[PDB]
C-alpha cells in the first residue's frame, strides 16, 4: 500500500522512538530513585532535559537540509544516540557521567528528530494520494514504538536495573541502524542535496565539534536550570522580536502561544501524572498487576487506536480550541477522582486514570500532531524553530507546574497526597478550561484572518 | 513479585521477636513493605512499614515497641518486636505496594507473603 522505503522510515523511526521514551518513563523515578534526587529536583531537571531534547530540533533539521544530507545525518543522529543511551547505562557504575549522557542524549534528538520525517516527504510523488496515509502512519509507528517502552522499560528497571533498561535502548537504536543500513538502496534517490555529492569533512567537523559543544551547554543548562531560565527568556523575546519584523504570522503566533499551554500539559504525564499514579491509584486493572509507571503507556495507547478512527472523521483553529477542551477534561478527571471517588484508604481506581490519558490523548491528536503539518503549511524554516523553542519553553514551565504536586521523602500516608494531586489537577483544568473559552471565543476572528 | 516471611514463633510476653521479609525476582528497593497481622477471629491490620525512601509508618498500639527497617543491600526488610505482650498474637504477612506510600488496608498492596505464626505467651518464670 506504500512505497518500499516507507517501510524502512517507518522501523527505524519506531525503534529510536523507543529508545527515547524507554528513559523518559523511568527518567524521574530514577532521579528520585537512584540519585536520591526530592521529586522538586526531578520534576524540574526532566523539565529541562526534555526542554533541550525538543528545542535543539532545529539544529538538525539545518543539518540535515544543508550541511552532511538527510540521510548521512540520520545515521550520524542514531549514533549520537546510542552512544547517550549506553552512556546512561554507564552512568551507575559513573554518577557523576549522568549529566554528559543526558545531553549527549539531546543533542543526538536534536540531530535525529528531524530527518525520517524529511525523508519520507520525499518518498512519494509530490502531490501522491498516500500522503496523508502515510504520515498517519508515521505518527503511529511513533507512538508504537513509545508504547512498547513506556510498557516495558519501568517492569525491566524492576527487574533488573537500570543499567540494562538504558543498554536496551541504546541496542534499540543499534537495530533501528542495522535496519537503516541493511535497507540503504531502498533510498538511494532520496535525500536533500548534500546527499548526493560526497561528504564535506570540513562540515562533518564543523557538527561534531558543535555537537560536543552542546553536549556539554546541555549537561551545564540540566544542572543549573535556575539559568536555563534565564537563557530561554532571553532567547523568547529575541525570537518573538526577529518574528514580528518577518497578518497570517499572527495566526502561527496565537495558536504557537496556545500550543505553549497544551506543551505544559504534556509535560505532567512523566512527572505528576506518573507520581500520582504511583501514591493514589490502585496498581491492578482487570486482575492483573502492574508497575504504576508504566500507566504513563496510556497515552500512546489511545494515540494507536484513536489516529485511525480520527483520521477517517471550525477547520484548524476549532480544533486547537477542542484539543484545549479536552486536556480540560482530562485534568478536570484527574480532580474528580481524587475529591469523590477515592478509597478510604485515599487511593483512586486505575479506570479513572484509563480516561484522563484518553482525554489528553484526544487533545494531543487535535493540537500536537495536527497542528505541526498543516501550521507550517498555512505560513518557513524560522516558524519550525520557533515552534520548538516555544515548546522547549513549555517543557521547562511544565517542570516547574510538577513541583507543585511534589512529596516529601517521609510522607506514607495517600490520604496527605491526594488533596495536594487534587488542588493542583482542579487548577491546571480550570485554567486550560479558561484557556479554551479565550481560544474559542477568537475562532471566528482567527479564522477571517486565514483568509 | 513473591516475598518469603521468617523468624515467627512463640515467646514470653515482654521478649521479642524479629520478622524478615525476602523477595526473589525484582529489587525490593522499589517498593514499600507493611507488615499486617491477623490474629484468631480477626481481619488483617496494618502493623508497621517503610516505604522506598526510609518513611515509616505505624499502628498506634505497637508504637515504641516495633521497628521496622531496611538492609537495602541484602535487600531485606526488618520487624523487631520488643516488650511483646499476648494480645501481638498473630499471623504476620508482609506485602509490597511499589513506591513511597502505605495505604492500611490490604487492597492497596499487590505482593503478599505466606504469613509467620506469631505467639506470645503470658508465661513468667515462678516466684
Ligand atoms: C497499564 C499499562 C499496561 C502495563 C503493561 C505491562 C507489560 C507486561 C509486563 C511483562 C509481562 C508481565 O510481567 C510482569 O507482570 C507482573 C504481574 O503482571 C507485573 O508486576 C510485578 O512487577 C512490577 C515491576 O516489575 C511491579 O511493579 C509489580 O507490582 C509486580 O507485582 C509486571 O507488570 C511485570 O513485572
Ligand atoms: C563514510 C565515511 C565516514 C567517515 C568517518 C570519519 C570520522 C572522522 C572523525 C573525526 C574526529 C573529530
Ligand atoms: C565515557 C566517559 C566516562 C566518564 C566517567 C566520569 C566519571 C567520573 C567519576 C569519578
Ligand atoms: C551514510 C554514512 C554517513 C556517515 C556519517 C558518520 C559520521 C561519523
Ligand atoms: C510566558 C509565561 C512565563 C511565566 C513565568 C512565571
Redesign the pocket.
Known amino acids: 500500500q506504500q512505497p518500499r522505503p516507507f517501510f524502512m522510515i517507518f522501523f527505524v523511526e519506531l525503534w529510536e522512538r523507543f529508545g527515547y521514551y524507554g528513559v523518559q518513563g523511568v527518567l524521574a523515578v530514577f532521579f528520585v530513585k537512584q540519585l536520591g534526587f526530592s521529586q522538586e529536583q526531578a520534576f524540574v531537571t526532566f523539565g529541562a532535559f526534555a526542554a533541550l531534547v525538543y528545542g535543539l530540533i532545529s539544529i538538525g533539521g539545518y543539518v540535515g537540509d544543508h550541511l552532511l544530507g538527510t540521510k548521512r545525518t540520520i545515521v550520524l543522529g542514531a549514533l549520537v544516540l546510542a552512544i547517550g543511551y549506553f552512556?546512561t547505562g554507564?552512568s551507575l557504575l559513573?554518577?557523576?557521567?549522568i549529566f554528559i549522557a543526558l545531553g549527549t542524549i539531546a543533542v543526538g534528538n536534536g540531530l535525529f528528530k528531524a530527518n525520517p520525517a524529511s525523508l519520507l516527504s520525499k518518498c512519494y510523488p509530490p502531490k501522491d494520494p498516500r500522503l496523508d496515509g502515510a504520515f498517519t502512519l508515521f505518527y503511529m509507528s511513533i507512538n508504537i514504538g513509545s508504547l512498547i517502552a513506556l510498557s516495558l522499560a519501568p517492569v525491566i528497571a524492576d527487574r533488573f536495573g537500570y543499567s540494562v533498561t538504558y543498554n536496551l535502548c541504546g541496542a534499540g537504536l543499534i537495530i533501528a541502524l542495522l535496519v537503516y543500513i541493511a535497507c540503504r538502496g531502498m533510498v538511494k534517490d532520496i535525500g536533500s542535496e548534500p546527499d548526493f555529492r560526497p561528504m564535506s569533512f570540513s562540515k562533518l567537523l564543523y557538527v561534531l565539534l558543535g555537537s560536543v559543544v552542546m553536549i556539554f551547554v546541555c549537561a551545564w543548562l540540566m544542572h543549573n536550570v535556575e539559568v536555563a531560565n534565564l537563557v530561554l527568556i532571553v532567547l523568547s523575546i529575541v525570537v518573538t522580536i526577529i518574528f514580528f519584523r518577518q497578518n497570517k504570522m499572527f495566526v502561527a503566533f496565537v495558536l504557537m502561544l496556545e500550543a505553549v499551554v497544551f506543551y505544559i500539559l504534556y509535560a505532567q504525564m512523566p512527572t505528576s501524572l506518573n507520581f500520582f499514579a504511583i501514591n493514589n491509584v490502585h496498581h491492578e486493572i482487570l486482575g492483573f498487576s502492574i508497575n504504576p509507571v508504566s500507566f504513563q503507556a496510556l497515552n500512546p495507547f489511545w494515540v494507536v487506536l484513536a489516529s485511525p478512527i480520527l483520521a477517517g472523521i471550525l477547520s484548524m483553529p476549532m480544533k486547537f480550541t477542542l484539543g484545549m477542551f479536552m486536556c480540560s477534561l482530562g485534568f478536570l478527571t484527574a480532580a474528580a477522582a481524587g475529591m469523590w471517588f477515592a478509597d478510604a484508604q485515599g487511593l483512586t481506581s486505575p479506570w479513572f486514570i484509563v480516561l484522563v490519558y484518553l482525554f489528553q490523548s484526544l487533545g494531543e491528536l487535535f493540537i500536537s500532531a495536527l497542528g505541526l503539518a498543516m501550521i507550517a503549511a498555512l505560513v518557513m524554516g524560522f516558524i519550525l524553530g520557533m515552534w520548538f523553542l516555544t515548546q522547549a519553553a513549555a517543557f521547562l514551565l511544565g517542570g516547574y507546574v510538577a513541583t507543585f504536586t511534589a512529596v516529601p521523602d517521609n510522607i506514607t500516608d495517600p490520604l496527605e497526597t491526594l488533596p495536594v494531586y487534587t488542588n493542583v489537577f482542579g487548577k491546571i483544568g480550570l485554567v486550560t478550561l479558561g484557556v479554551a473559552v479565550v481560544m474559542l471565543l477568537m475562532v471566528p476572528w482567527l479564522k477571517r484572518m486565514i483568509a | 513479585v513473591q516475598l518469603v516471611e521468617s523468624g515467627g514463633g512463640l515467646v514470653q510476653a515482654g521478649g521479642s521477636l524479629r520478622l524478615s521479609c525476602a523477595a526473589s525476582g525484582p529489587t525490593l528497593s522499589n517498593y514499600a513493605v507493611g507488615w499486617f497481622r491477623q490474629a484468631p477471629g480477626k481481619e488483617r491490620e496494618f502493623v508497621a512499614g517503610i516505604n522506598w525512601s526510609s518513611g515509616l509508618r505505624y499502628k498506634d498500639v505497637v508504637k515504641g515497641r516495633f521497628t521496622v527497617s531496611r538492609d537495602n543491600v541484602k535487600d531485606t526488610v526488618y520487624l523487631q518486636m520488643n516488650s511483646l505482650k499476648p494480645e501481638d498474637t498473630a499471623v504476620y504477612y508482609c506485602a509490597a505496594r511499589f513506591g513511597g506510600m502505605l495505604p492500611l488496608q490490604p487492597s492497596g498492596y499487590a505482593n503478599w507473603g505466606q504469613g509467620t505464626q506469631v505467639t506470645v505467651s503470658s508465661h513468667h518464670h515462678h516466684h
Open positions: 552512556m554507564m559513573k554518577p557523576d557521567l
